[PDB]
């Protein structure tokens, strides 16, 4: 986890860094719901 600041880990059960632009984008991109939770 903790990739370059342009990326966020979309989960904690396994490492999966994805674009920060996808946080609260309207869909879950990964195995864990923290795209859309409590924006």
């Amino acid at each position: 986890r903790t990739c370059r600041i342009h990326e966020i880990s979309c989960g904690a059960h396994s490492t999966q860094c994805i674009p920060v632009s996808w946080r609260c984008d309207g869909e879950n991109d990964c195995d864990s719901g923290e795209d859309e939770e409590n924006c």
Binding site: I18, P19, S21, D29
Partner: protein, 49 residues
């Protein structure tokens, strides 16, 4: 940006209706996830997104 490669297309359905009646799944090989711009270079078909 993503280094998108091996881009290929198949058209899942196409009706030449007045709306966006065609659907084309795009198979690609990237190196990272990311937002790519998409365009149709020939004016016979306009994309929705």
């Amino acid at each position: 940006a993503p280094a998108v490669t091996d881009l290929s297309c198949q058209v899942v359905v196409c009706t030449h209706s007045s709306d966006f009646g065609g659907v084309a799944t795009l198979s690609y090989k990237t190196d990272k996830p990311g937002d790519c711009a998409v365009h149709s270079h020939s004016n016979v078909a306009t994309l929705q997104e």
